[PDB]
Amino acid sequence: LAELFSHTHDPDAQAKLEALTAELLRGRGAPMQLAAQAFPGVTQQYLALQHALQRGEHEDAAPHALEALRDALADLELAHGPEIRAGINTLPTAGAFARSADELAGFQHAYRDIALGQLSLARTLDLVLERYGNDDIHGALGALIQALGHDLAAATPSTDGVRLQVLASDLYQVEVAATVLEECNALKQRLGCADAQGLMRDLVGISEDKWIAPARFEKLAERHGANALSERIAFLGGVRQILKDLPTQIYADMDVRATVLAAAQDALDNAIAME
Ligand SMILES: [Ca+2]
Ligand SMILES: [Cl-]
Ligand code: NA
């Protein structure tokens, strides 16, 4: 258990756990609060409380202090059982990807929301863009898929095997999409928070807009400073190309995709017609 905290990549991880253990067994503070102050992520908190309990029993700690740890562990299992299972099952993978305690917890939170949520492909893509968009988005996705594999490999996966298999296929589509969306960098660079990352998330939003119309693309253009006629045409042309290459599975459905692309084309043509 103590060795598992090496995955935080905190040079004082071990000392911190031992200090926390002493504080927990001292029995003044609320176990859950103390654990959360020491380590981010319920997975690390759960493991720390478990470590303290085992030590406390062997060390012959106060029965009341031990009981408080048992209650805390039981509360966490009841409220966050699947999340903790997901974290435990994927710790080696998460450890290999994360470079700090915050990055570890961050990865676990992303994995939790995907694995245990009911997110559409678009919302999953948006989640990944928000967290990893201007960092190692492809590394994050590859690690998430490794995590899905380690979860399914475990004796008790965090959710059903059928769902984990579907999620691996979903995340492949997200990886294809994330690659396509890199074109937003070049587009913003050519034309000159409404940055490239913002545009990527804007396009993903558009992919689930069943009420999409050409007017929405005008507002997008305005948001991104493509106001002059030439830049407006170039921007709308770029956006349509990117939307077109975005995998069909990202869109709310095939019909919404068709509407989006027809609207994007019309917005482009309207701008061209002004020239
Ligand atoms: Ca004794
Ligand atoms: Cl289509
Ligand atoms: Na990878």
Task: Explain how this protein is built.
GO terms for molecular function: metal ion binding. Keywords: Calcium, Metal-binding. The chain is an all-alpha fold and about 280 residues long. The chain folds into three domains: about 1-90; about 90-180, no CATH class; about 185-275, Monooxygenase (Up-down Bundle), CATH 1.20.1280.80. Helices cover about 75% and strands about 0% of the residues. The protein is built from 14 helices and no strands. The protein has helices at about 15-25, 30-40, 40-60, 65-90, 90-95, 100-115, 120-130, 135-155, 160-180, 185-190, 195-205, 215-225, 230-245, 255-275. The chain is elongated and about 85 Å long. Sodium ion binds next to helix 8.
What is the CATH top level name of the largest domain? Answer: Mainly Alpha
Count up the helices: 14
List the ligand species. calcium ion, chloride ion, sodium ion
Indicate the radius of gyration in whole angstroms: 24 Å
Note the run of SSEs as H and E. HHHHHHHHHHHHHH
* Helix share bin: over 70%
Largest sheet: none
For the record, the count of structural domains works out to 3
Quantity of strands, as a count = 0
- What is the 3D form? elongated
CATH architecture of the largest domain: Up-down Bundle
Structural class: mainly alpha
CATH topology of the largest domain: Monooxygenase
Percent strand: under 5%
Q: Termini, distance in Å?
A: 68 Å
Keywords: Calcium, Metal-binding
Domain Type III secretion system effector delivery regulator TyeA: 197-275
Protein name: Outer protein N
Organism: Bordetella pertussis (strain Tohama I / ATCC BAA-589 / NCTC 13251)
